[PDB]
Amino acid sequence: AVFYKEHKLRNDGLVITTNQGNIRLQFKSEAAIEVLYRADSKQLPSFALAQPESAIKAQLTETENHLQFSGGTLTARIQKRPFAISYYRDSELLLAEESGFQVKINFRFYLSPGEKILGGGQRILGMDRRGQRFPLYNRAHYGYSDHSGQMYFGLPAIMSSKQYILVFDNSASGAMDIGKTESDILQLEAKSGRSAYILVAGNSYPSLIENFTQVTGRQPLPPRWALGSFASRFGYRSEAETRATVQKYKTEDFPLDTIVLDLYWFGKDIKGHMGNLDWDKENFPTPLDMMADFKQQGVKTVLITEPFVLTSSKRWDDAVKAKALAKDPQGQPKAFELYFGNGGIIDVFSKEGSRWFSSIYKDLSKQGVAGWWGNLGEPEMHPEDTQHAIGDADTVHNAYGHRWAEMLYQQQLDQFPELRPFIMMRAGFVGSQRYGMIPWTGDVSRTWGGLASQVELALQMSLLGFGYIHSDLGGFADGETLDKEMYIRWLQYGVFQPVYRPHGQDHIPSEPVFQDEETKAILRPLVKLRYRMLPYIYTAAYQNTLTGMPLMRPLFFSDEKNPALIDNKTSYFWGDSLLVTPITQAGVESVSIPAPKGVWFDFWKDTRYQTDGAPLTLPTDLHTIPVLVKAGAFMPYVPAVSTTEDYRSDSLEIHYYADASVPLAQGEIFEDDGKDPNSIKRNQFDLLTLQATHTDNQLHFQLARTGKGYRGMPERRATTLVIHNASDQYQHLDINGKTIAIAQADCASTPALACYDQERRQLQLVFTWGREALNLRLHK
Ligand SMILES: OC[C@@H]1[C@@H](O)[C@H](O)[C@@H](O)[C@H]2N[C@@H]12
Ligand SMILES: O=C([O-])C(=O)[O-]
């Protein structure tokens, strides 16, 4: 039994007193509120909030039975007796406390009937997690396939079909019960830690996500090279093997930006060496030369590191001496028995641990390392009596990887202010995207079921802040022989998901260059396609930095008033314009694609489909997976290069999918130097915009460029615009007032400036796109 006693306004926050204690309500923006219970007491600080100190001016009003605390769009309605807070956007009820806060830490809320709930981070349970209960304790799930209640990267957060996100801003071992035990109750629980939640509201899913990343953090633009081709396995055993792999990409004509070194870079065995954090010189004898030789070919080197220092490692005595390891209650370094052997964990929450670990990353980065892979950050083993500077293991567990990322990000920015950090990690917390975290879905089995789960995992993580969530392409764990069809399908899917990193245990090759002739003939043009599409992908990345819009978007974005689409995990959007349906079983001869109402083109064949609502059935083939292009799309391409270090946009090729059903369309292409972390902040970019206006007798394109440019930006780009489904009735083209005849023959066979191909229904315009505005008008 709880009731309101009294309140006050202090530094813009509402502090309420009940019979049980203080409750602090601070608006972190007009659409987001932090509710801290036990506000009087000492607690762990917020991990989820980018600006935990902020509180914007809100309006407070009082009635007999209630208080009302409001920002722009979000309102807290505080019932006094009994005490219960509920939340409104306009006058629409978003979420209501049932018992609310109790004692262990426990929050209880009502779920509305029919409300669907996404959330929890990585689980394989279905997109709507209502009816499920699961722990909040990051933990490995080696060899998962088609089911998991608990894996590497949980998030104490949910997204509802009422268009709110609720964050449990707590780092401890806990649980979430989403109307499982009691059908109308959402229950959040933890053994300890901060007793706070954060509610964020939005008018649409895009703007919900914008509001969420506003308060939790925006991912800084990764380096363009993160969108390229990675060579990775577990693991290259030597410098010779690593050089041979870079050579294999060159001799097989596959693009390659980055080679990834797993744990053999620091010792010859899986066990016994972890914590060395230095080169195994028997097997990597000249590593500075190795890395420099790779940079000459435009190839970056990424190294694996882990949180654990073994007692057999060369750095045990030094870490103990520096007080860098987590301790037992007696105050000594805690040691425990990992797979790898007996060892400790670096205390990233301490000053000494942070300085010690940072110094090692600084040293190796000085040697030539371009980026970093932090594995086992759950932490994979984390005994409960381990003591970190700010709490015990069970209290801090779900924030360890988050602080690891923060530490490393700040260190990389301090060492290289002019470069974008690359940080790939397996486990984090809400807001870890602000430290550049690029997560992957862990040790997936080499099975169709492991592939079939990747879209679900990717969308769940994308929706709550993680644009660059990806998988070990081709699968990671076990297998005795390559499943060639599954491998091909996983790497085709790869092209249309955030990071192109095939990776597997090295008894079966993960890299496409080591595959048979048929597999390489299929995949080589697709990996080249990934490079030709960099302007599309990099522009979606730019949008993710600006607004949190994920790269992969769920089918349900296409119709916000049809909540049944929330269940789909088999088709998704890659950027604005491509509806992708990965093939996730062997021998599938056709697929039924639940395309939204409108006009759609076969990405591979140019075929036009119109649909009222009924799904489209497309046949399948082994060389592609089904991709449809939305009418009104602008798809930008550049020529394929071997490495993004060679990237040029001097030549553009843009494909516009015309249909009279889309009278107005827009596209953009974001160009910058691909490496400067301050490019967007300082407007050191070239933002190309394109607008189409499509009426009965004309098709008009308006082209423009903004921003201050960047060093090496071409002043003039040779541009080929290919208009698919173009009317055969266009008589002439006006370019900036200058009339040009449209040729009706020999388009492919003459240096034609405007040419209509009657057999393909494609009108091709070739022109120079300079810094001034350009208008292209086609008239019947
Ligand atoms: O470090 C070896 C291996 C790594 O390649 C995978 O990416 C990780 O998830 C952990 N299983 C380990
Ligand atoms: O729709 C058009 O503009 C046409 O096909 O002629």
From Swiss-Prot:
Its EC number is 2.4.1.161. Gene3D superfamilies: Glycosidases, glycosyl hydrolase (family 31), Golgi alpha-mannosidase II. It catalyses: Transfers the non-reducing terminal alpha-D-glucose residue from a (1->4)-alpha-D-glucan to the 4-position of a free glucose or of a glucosyl residue at the non-reducing terminus of a (1->4)-alpha-D-glucan, thus bringing about the rearrangement of oligosaccharides. CDD domains: GH31_N (cd14752), GH31_transferase_CtsZ (cd06598). One of its GO terms (biological process) is carbohydrate metabolic process. Transmembrane segments: none annotated. The active site is at residues 375, 378, 443. Keywords: Glycosyltransferase, Signal, Transferase. InterPro entries: DUF5110, Gal_mutarotase_sf_dom, Glyco_hydro_31_C, Glyco_hydro_31_N_dom, Glyco_hydro_31_TIM, Glyco_hydro_b, Glycoside_hydrolase_SF. One of its GO terms (molecular function) is hydrolase activity, hydrolyzing O-glycosyl compounds. Acarbose binds at residues 262, 380, 426, 443, 503. Alpha-transglucosylase that specifically transfers single glucosyl units from alpha(1->4)-glucans to the non-reducing terminal 4-OH of glucose and alpha(1->4)- and alpha(1->6)-linked glucosyl residues. Acts on amylose, amylopectin, glycogen and maltooligosaccharides, with the highest activity with maltotriose as a donor, and also accepts maltose. Does not act as a hydrolase: weak hydrolysis activity is only observed on the disaccharide maltose. PANTHER family: ALPHA-GLUCOSIDASE (PTHR22762), HETEROGLYCAN GLUCOSIDASE 1 (PTHR22762:SF120). Belongs to the glycosyl hydrolase 31 family. This is Oligosaccharide 4-alpha-D-glucosyltransferase. It comes from Cellvibrio japonicus (strain Ueda107). The gene is agd31B.
